[PDB]
């Protein structure tokens, strides 16, 4: 018996159903989720991939025979499943033809009842078994993939010949999508032999229940998947443009988010605000069109039905002698109900069929790639893959547990030798001779996406001792400490960005810090300051390496410090020039030795659905479009349902015109109201997704700049990008789903119900049963995905992290850790969404049973209670009928709650408060020269950056003449920037008044303060697009001003140095512009604002000398007229100015001439 029940446990998902049900209690986390079966494991299934891929290489090799040898056993038994499904669904219509009609019990009508509901129970059993048998073996191959191509990139060659610049845009594209869509293929795999088969048996069906006459609906029908494939096409057209241009607004919502403070201090961000909406207008145009066409798809899945029903009877009726008798009729119509779905879904399993034959060809394409005392080398000539000779001659020699500097001019070949050596060049010659794992420190620094912490250690056991000793050999210790965390400090790409010197010292430290005889640092001091480098080389390179006897190679073009390499390589254009000591190399090279002298000497608690946000979505559109919408599916159900109910009045009969007439009409009636239903579906999206992006967007750059402080950027971006994209996309289909699902099902109940009035007493605990497996399920899921997106998400970053910096893995041969990760990883994101799967086979079950006992009771009590026989007929229809849409309603119901907390997120940004841009001082009342003279004074000012803080300024009072320059200084956190940020109002007032030419700052529109005020900050900032653009957004100046500003700033020859002069192109982030010319570039936009009160915070900071002097220059000429309030660290260019407040941590301090209080903290910092 045991046996026996565990497969039925097997078959009926039993052992998800305790997951499920505890959904409730806790939250369903890693540990309530098992380890894979040793069967499911990724190390298997790559074994079996690898095995088969082999054998065929054996004998060009194809991806697809390997897949098959490896996965074809289960295929084969979900197709077997698959057609053992098809043949009982097919006792669907023949069972309520033998009903409707009604030793051979077969015919007594009664045991035909039971015969369609086992045969219907073991239908949806097969089913499900079938689906979670292909998508395991999806899953599995996934698994498979994924650690064959990992395999193949810690296998790859980093010759920038094969290593490209997009190669990695090409392993993560493999990662991410094309192994996806691969998975997919494996999904639906057994759909492309299953679904042909139905469809010609059901064709069949339809030809021998109802005459010759089946023949045109059959075609009507098929006619449904050219053109569903066609509208697909056109759908995947229309999004690609949809993604395009929602790319290029995302863009620029990242630009303004990145910059805000700016932008909002020189009054740009409405100007930046109509150019993400221009962007989104376009978007918005792409989109009518994708929803133009996701609404005629709609339109046709819902009326080619119809329309091959009206052709099918009225053939019927005009060419057979027989009248339409009801068993055949309903029989027909359950065949055209079973037809529907797979003839609108072939379309999509042959395109998801293309797709994978497009990502197999990408897969076999990238796995044809190119691949591949102490240290001693004879005759090596080494190649990068080209074939030429970059490196030739060498007789390197590395003496063990001592230092070897290789010295040469850039372009030399240094690190080439480097690489050769750790094997990653193609070695045409000559051998490398070992007397085993390498630390190598790579010229470009590479760091993983974890904690500082675990980068230094990589991998090794922790030891205290040393990690401090690194640490402080290292010189990291103080910037270890302002991190904000210290220790245990994400970083990298996602991490907290840090600075190339400090990306560097990590690196040396992770270099130092493991336990190998051999090191290898290449280029370490590129991004060191000099008293960085001499402590690093004293304490680390020949105290800290030398303690353990370890033997070290140091590349760098510093000839400082060659007196303590024991042994040095002269090497110049790929050619090793002299190996020696350097008193051996200056005896027999004397010119080498005083040519490197020359260079010496230069210098649950909540699980209920949101319906609050979802009834405010469903208002947003307008009260009109969800009027109709509503109006338009009740009105076209009940078209549909008058239209069965009138075939059952014209089958109860046993001339035609009348019925005939009408049933066309209702037919007519139907399709036009499928297609305004769609219209009105898609209409409302549309102007849903218009109006809470154009609030969300207006909103947020309204807001506080507090809260850009607070919030990280990645939140609004997040926002930006993936709830715009659900409300745009996902949505509105979705409800379209759901609704038609609750409708049908509904009015099948009805339909039920009215024609059988004793299902009422067997519907009263189907409800409950439905609703127990609704609210289960709902949370179930709703945890699963989390789960599943969580899991995934550090797959594709550690791909990433691989792919990158292979050179370094590779070189400390931890290839097979990294390997064992990915397979950790894989295996735990194949799990979760195993489990997935499983859930929505738990469900799929559970509502097949319950559709299987409604059908049961329908059947039953139908015969039992006497009706027409075309009744009976429409009874036994919508009980099959609503079976198929249980399901679908309750998935639907789930992820519209899932989407739903995304509106609801959008909804909580739009709460947000926004700042008070109204001006209690009437707009009259502001001259428009208001700035010209520039007095400025301040009252005991109290600034707090946000209320219920401590002061960062308190009590200031100070006068400035008009015209004159000001000068700030101070330590830093002195709140030397408070004060520029209450100037613009940026930073609320605690305390206080400002007067600027004779009107309180704080009572102005503050568009207008801060449009008239100049700022420059610490890191000059540039906008994506044109030189004029940045000059002048609002283009209310003439173009000659902008050339006299670049003239000023001595920025016209650059200007005209590029093509196109002022319409020159400029890239976000200065990227086209050195530090000091972006820095000018600000300058000259202060210039050309001609507010006649100039703010600068820091800006000498992060300038050339020769930048920082012509920035000097330019201020002192150009901005002689207007006021200047200078916030620089450097005292030397505030002992020009003419008054100086220095502050310390909220006091005015000294106020005076420079002179005057050098009569002394300003005295100790000069
Ligand atoms: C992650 C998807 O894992 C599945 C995988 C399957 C296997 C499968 O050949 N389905 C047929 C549907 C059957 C009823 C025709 C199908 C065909 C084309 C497109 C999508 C689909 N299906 C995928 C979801 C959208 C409609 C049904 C089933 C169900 C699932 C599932 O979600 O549980
Ligand atoms: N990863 C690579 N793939 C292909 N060719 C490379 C690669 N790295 C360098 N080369 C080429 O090999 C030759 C020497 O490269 P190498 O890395 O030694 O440059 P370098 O400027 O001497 O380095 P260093 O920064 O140590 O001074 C040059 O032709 C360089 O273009
Ligand atoms: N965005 C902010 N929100 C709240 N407080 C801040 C903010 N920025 C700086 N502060 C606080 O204000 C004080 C003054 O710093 P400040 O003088 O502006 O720094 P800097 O010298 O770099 O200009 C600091 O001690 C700091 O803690
Ligand atoms: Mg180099
Ligand atoms: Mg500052």
């Known amino acids: 018996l045991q046996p026996f029940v565990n497969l039925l446990s097997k078959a009926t998902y039993w052992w998800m159903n305790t997951l499920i049900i505890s959904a409730h209690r806790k939250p369903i986390d890693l540990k309530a989720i098992g380890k894979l079966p040793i069967a499911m494991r990724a190390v298997t299934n790559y074994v079996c991939l690898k095995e088969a891929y082999e054998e065929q290489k054996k004998k060009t090799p194809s991806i697809w025979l390997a897949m098959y040898r490896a996965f074809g056993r289960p295929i084969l038994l979900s197709s077997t499943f698959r057609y053992l499904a098809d043949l009982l669904g097919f006792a669907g219509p023949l069972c309520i033809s033998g009903i409707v009609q009604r030793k051979e019990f077969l015919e007594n009508a009664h045991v035909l009842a039971v015969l369609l509901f086992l045969a219907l129970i073991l239908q949806r059993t097969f089913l499900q078994a079938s689906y979670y048998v292909t998508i395991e073996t999806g899953i599995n191959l996934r698994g498979a993939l994924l650690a064959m191509i990992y395999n193949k990139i810690l296998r790859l060659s980093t010759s920038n010949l094969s290593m490209g610049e997009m190669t990695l845009g090409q392993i993560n594209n493999l990662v991410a999508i094309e192994t996806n869509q691969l998975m997919w293929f494996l999904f639906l795999c057994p759909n492309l032999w299953a679904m042909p088969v139905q469809i010609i048996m059901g064709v069949i069906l339809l030809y021998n229940l109802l005459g ?249 056991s922790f030891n205290r001792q040393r ?34 010197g400090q990306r560097q010292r990590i690196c040396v430290a992770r270099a130092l810090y493991q336990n190998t005889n051999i090191v290898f640092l290449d280029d370490p001091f590129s991004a060191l300051d000099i008293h960085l480098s001499d402590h690093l080389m004293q304490e680390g390179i020949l105290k800290f390496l030398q303690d353990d006897k370890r033997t070290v190679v140091l590349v760098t073009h510093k000839l400082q410090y060659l007196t303590h390499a024991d042994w040095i390589i002269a090497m110049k254009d790929g050619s090793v020039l002299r190996e020696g000591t350097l008193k051996d190399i200056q005896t027999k090279d004397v010119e080498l030795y005083e040519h490197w002298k020359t260079l010496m000497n230069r210098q649950r608690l909540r699980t209920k659905m949101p319906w609050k946000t979802c009834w405010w979505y469903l208002t947003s559109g307008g009260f009109f479009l969800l009027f109709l919408m509503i109006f338009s599916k009740l009105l076209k159900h009940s078209v549909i349902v008058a239209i069965d109910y009138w075939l059952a009045t014209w089958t109860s009969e046993y001339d035609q015109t009348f019925y005939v007439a009408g049933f066309s009409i209702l037919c007519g009636a139907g399709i036009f109201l499928c297609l305004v239903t769609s219209l009105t579906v898609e209409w409302m999206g549309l102007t849903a997704a218009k109006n809470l992006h154009h609030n969300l967007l207006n909103k947020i750059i309204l807001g506080p ?148 006992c409604i059908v049961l009771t329908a059947s039953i009590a139908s015969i039992s209670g006497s009706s027409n026989s075309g009744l009976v007929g429409l009874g036994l229809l919508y009980a099959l009928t609503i079976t198929n849409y249980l399901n679908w309603v309750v998935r639907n119901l789930a992820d519209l709650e899932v989407q739903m907390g995304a509106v609801k997120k959008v909804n909580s940004f739009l709460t947000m408060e926004s700042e008070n841009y109204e001006g209690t001082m009437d707009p009259s009342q502001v001259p428009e020269h208001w700035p010209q003279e520039g007095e400025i004074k301040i009252h005991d000012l109290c600034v707090r950056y946000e209320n219920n803080l401590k002061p960062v300024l308190k009590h200031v009072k100070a006068y400035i003449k008009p015209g004159q320059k000001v000068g700030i200084c101070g330590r830093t956190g002195s709140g030397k920037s408070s004060l520029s940020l209450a100037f613009f109002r940026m930073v609320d007032i605690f305390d206080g008044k400002i ?83 972006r820095q000018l570039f600000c300058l000259a936009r202060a210039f050309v604002r001609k507010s006649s009160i100039l703010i600068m915070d820091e800006a000498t900071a992060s300038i050339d000398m020769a930048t920082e002097n012509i920035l000097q220059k330019v201020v002192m000429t150009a901005f002689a007229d207007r006021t200047v309030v200078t916030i620089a660290h450097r005292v030397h260019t505030i002992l020009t100015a003419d008054l100086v407040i220095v502050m310390k941590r909220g006091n005015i301090l000294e106020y005076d001439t420079p002179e005057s209080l050098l009569a002394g903290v300003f005295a100790s910092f000069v």
């Not at 990238?366 to 893959?385: H, P, Q």
């Not at 400490?481 to 400090?489: A, E, I, N, S, V």
């Not at 997106?789 to 850790?817: K, M, N, V, W, Y």
């Not at 295996?827 to 489990?835: H, M, R």
């Open 212 to 460: 010759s006459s089946a023949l045109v609906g059959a075609a009507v029908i098929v006619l449904l998947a050219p053109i569903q494939y066609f509208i697909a096409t056109k759908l995947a057209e229309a999004q690609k443009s949809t993604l395009d241009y929602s790319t290029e607004r995302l863009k620029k919502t990242n630009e303004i988010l990145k910059g805000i403070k700016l932008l909002k201090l020189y009054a740009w961000e409405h100007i930046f605000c109509k150019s993400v909406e221009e962007t989104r207008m376009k978007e918005l145009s792409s989109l009518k069109t994708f929803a133009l066409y996701t609404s005629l798809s709609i339109f046709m899945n819902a009326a080619i039905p119809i329309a091959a029903v009206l052709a099918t009877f009225v053939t019927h009726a005009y060419a057979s002698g027989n009248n339409l008798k009801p068993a055949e009729a309903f029989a027909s119509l359950s065949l055209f109900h079973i037809l529907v779905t797979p003839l609108f879904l072939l379309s999509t399993v042959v395109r998801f069929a293309v797709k994978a034959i497009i990502s197999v060809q990408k897969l076999n394409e990238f796995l044809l790639s190119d691949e591949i005392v102490a240290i001693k080398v004879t005759n090596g000539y080494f190649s990068w893959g080209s074939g030429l000779a970059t490196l030739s001659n060498i007789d390197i020699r590395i003496p063990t547990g001592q230092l070897t500097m290789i010295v040469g001019q850039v372009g030399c070949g240094k690190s080439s030798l480097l690489l050769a050596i750790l094997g990653e060049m193609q070695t045409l010659e000559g051998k490398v001779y070992w007397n085993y794992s390498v630390a190598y420190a790579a010229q470009k620094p590479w760091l993983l996406n974890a904690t500082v912490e675990e980068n230094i250690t990589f991998g090794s």
């Open 467 to 500: 990690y401090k000793a690194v640490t402080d050999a290292c010189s990291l210790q103080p910037d270890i400490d302002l991190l904000p965390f210290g220790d245990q400090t994400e970083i990298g790409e996602r991490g907290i960005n840090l600075s190339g």
């Open 705 to 852: 700049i507090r809260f850009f402080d607070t919030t990280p950027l990645g939140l609004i971006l997040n926002r930006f990008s993936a709830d715009t994209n659900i409300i745009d996309q996902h949505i509105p289909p979705t409800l379209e789903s759901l609704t038609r699902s609750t409708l049908l099902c509904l009015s099948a109940i009805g339909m039920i119900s009215y024609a059988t009035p004793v299902f009422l007493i067997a519907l009263a605990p189907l409800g409950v049963a439905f609703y127990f497996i609704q609210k289960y399920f709902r949370v179930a899921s709703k945890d699963l995905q989390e789960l599943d997106d969580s899991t995934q998400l550090p797959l594709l970053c550690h791909f990433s992290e691989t792919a990158e910096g292979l050179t370094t893995i590779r070189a400390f041969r931890h290839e097979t850790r990294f390997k064992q990760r990915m397979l950790e990883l894989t295996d735990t994101n194949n799990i979760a969404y195993l489990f997935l799967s499983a859930a929505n086979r738990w469900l799929e079950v559970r509502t097949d049973y319950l559709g299987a």
């Open 995 to 1077: 007067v600027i030419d004779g009107i309180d700052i704080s009572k102005l529109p503050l568009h207008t303060l801060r449009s008239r005020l100049s700022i420059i900050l610490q890191d000059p900032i540039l906008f994506s697009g044109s030189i004029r653009f940045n000059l002048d957004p609002e283009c209310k100046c003439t173009d000659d001003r902008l050339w006299e500003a670049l003239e000023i700033a001595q920025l016209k020859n650059m200007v005209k140095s590029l093509p196109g002069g002022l319409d020159a192109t400029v890239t976000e982030g200065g990227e086209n512009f050195s530090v000091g010319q």
